[PDB]
Design a protein around this ligand. Sequence first.
Ligand SMILES: OC[C@H]1O[C@H](O[C@H]2[C@H](O)[C@@H](O)[C@@H](O)O[C@@H]2CO)[C@H](O)[C@@H](O)[C@@H]1O
Ligand SMILES: OC[C@H]1O[C@H](O[C@H]2[C@H](O)[C@@H](O)[C@@H](O)O[C@@H]2CO)[C@H](O)[C@@H](O)[C@@H]1O
Ligand code: NI
Ligand code: NI
Lengths: 369, 370
Amino acid sequence: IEEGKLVIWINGDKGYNGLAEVGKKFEKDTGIKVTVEHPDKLEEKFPQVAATGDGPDIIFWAHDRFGGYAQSGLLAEITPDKAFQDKLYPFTWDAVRYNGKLIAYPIAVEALSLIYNKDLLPNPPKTWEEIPALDKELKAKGKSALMFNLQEPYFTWPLIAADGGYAFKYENGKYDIKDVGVDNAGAKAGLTFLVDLIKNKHMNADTDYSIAEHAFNHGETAMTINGPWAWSNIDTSKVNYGVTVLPTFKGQPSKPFVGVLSAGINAASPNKELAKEFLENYLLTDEGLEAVNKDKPLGAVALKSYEEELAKDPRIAATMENAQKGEIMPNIPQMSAFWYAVRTAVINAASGRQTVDAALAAAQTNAAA
Amino acid sequence: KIEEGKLVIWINGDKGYNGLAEVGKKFEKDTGIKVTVEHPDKLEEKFPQVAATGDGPDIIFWAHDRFGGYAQSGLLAEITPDKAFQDKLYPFTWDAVRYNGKLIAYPIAVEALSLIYNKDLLPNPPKTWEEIPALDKELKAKGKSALMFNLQEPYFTWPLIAADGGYAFKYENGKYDIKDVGVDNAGAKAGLTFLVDLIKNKHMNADTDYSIAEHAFNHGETAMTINGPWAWSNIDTSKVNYGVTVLPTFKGQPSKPFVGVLSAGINAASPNKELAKEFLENYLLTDEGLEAVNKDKPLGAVALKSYEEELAKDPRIAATMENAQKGEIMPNIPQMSAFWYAVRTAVINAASGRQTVDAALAAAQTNAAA
Ligand SMILES: OC[C@H]1O[C@H](O[C@H]2[C@H](O)[C@@H](O)[C@@H](O)O[C@@H]2CO)[C@H](O)[C@@H](O)[C@@H]1O
Ligand SMILES: OC[C@H]1O[C@H](O[C@H]2[C@H](O)[C@@H](O)[C@@H](O)O[C@@H]2CO)[C@H](O)[C@@H](O)[C@@H]1O
Ligand code: NI
Ligand code: NI
């Protein structure tokens, strides 16, 4: 890492162009260059390169990964005063607190919603169960009912959790890392339903982020599942879209894992104080989050003042409703194992390489340790 | 069923469908006939299914290799250009679209993959595949990667597979021997092993697809990519300073991209065959028609003599044909789709490590020749 400059990592689906603008603002003021990068698999890269005193000064990701990073000593403890902390919602600080210590700045709260084409589908379905029928209706007109990223368990988890699936049993403010709920009747029922959609040709196992985004944004599919970041490209595509509550499964709300986009400071950084200044004084302000948000919507920001200003957006409202129906992700170190294990189970099951039960059985064992 | 009095066109989403739409607008302006260009996923798999029932597009666009099977399945109308029109297009492009004695599509343009490289990151791209690993180790220390390209489709990995002796079907006595497949021979195994090692040694990832490779190169995260003329538009817009050149050699031998002629077939079930003929002959296959499409996404070396002649000066086009002459024109026989799926499975299974190269290619050999 180079002293006297800021290197930033943020995921490619976030507003890195909006952010780089803030970084140029930071440069004009302090003369400090702010390079914004978006590496593939950055959540895997970071720990790798950071373990050897390398990487970016600042790293952006959902809060779930930061616990593991902190346990690995890859993060510097941030030092915001009470005046600053009070600018952000206490529940977002909660998401980035590990072992009593604040290990990153919260930026925004993210949740998946059902996104639907209002012209194709004036009244979107309330349930997963009515999708096969809808799809058959749309296939006759050369469209599909629903397409969404089947490659990342983040997009499929809401369905798996609906009827009883869960990652780690959470009771009395503690997660039981040995009480995993990926192979219970609930989790199996959800994943089986997904696999049945694929077998019945209502979806394809190889659908990923780009295939789904293209499909929805060109009006090839009536629905997709995505987060606030996705809205800008839809704006651009001019599809008349709405954002609403996710379909129920067996009468139960889908339960998305809620993410808090956070900014961590590399423990190897020689630019910690600079990192602090940039994050507290430029990014985490009404105009800073505005620049990012204009590029790619952040969702419900952690900054109270801007969250209030944007709260009137029905898309954000829908995002919070789904958020209330889901659960905020744990940030414990065991999350990476959980995600990896479930990713494998879903891909193996969807592709037909393994039975649902066998896939989730293996994921269950692998998530525990 | 197919609607009378309008044209519906299927074309893959990596091509200039907006450019083609403009040609359709000109067509509608002059004839009053609406032209709708669509880009379904998996269109080459959907066509034979829906055309069989009398459904689908009036015109399908795809590389010539698929059209043989569509023709054998009775899904394509024989096209009827007069001699005067055939003289407007290169004979070898008409050859690409002839099947069992009949013309079964209009050739549009010739495609071949080239090595695309970032001039600012890489002033002197590697001449060989063998020097890429050391090049990557070097760039990874600058926060970059040497090379990223779509590993999901065998079309992109084939140049390397074929370099040392891999092939689809052996030509004998004026026709392809459908039982002589060269996908599990030594050359084919050497090529796929080299790919697999690149993945094993963290120089590439098995999961890299088109979007990831295009994103990476167009943002200068990787110094090189592999792709065809359609991809150039997006690089232009990315402002990346790029060059189009000859693909790397493998074991001192040229990579051999499979050459495809983008072709336009008329659905045998279409009640708009005369409209399709007029659109294709009088609107698309003209200087002004190909130009509209090319300026959206470059076509490569177009089949129209006149337009090809003025574009030939383009260094990227010349580079495309340099790689195309080093390659082989794809067969158009019905067995191609079986070949492609067998190889697709093979490359994915081996790259993911779920199967060994030998096993993957041994299964692919049997499957293609099935
Ligand atoms: O799918 C596994 C993945 O889920 C979450 O990642 C999300 C991320 O939070 C979103 O902001 C967006 O970028 O999509 C990602 C999924 O592709 C977890 O945060 C992540 O740790 C986990 O691996
Ligand atoms: O990968 C198998 C695939 O290869 C060829 O498809 C090419 C096509 O020719 C290009 O124009 C471009 O669209 O990329 C495709 C590969 O993704 C064959 O034409 C096709 O039949 C075959 O399935
Ligand atoms: Ni990127
Ligand atoms: Ni499309």
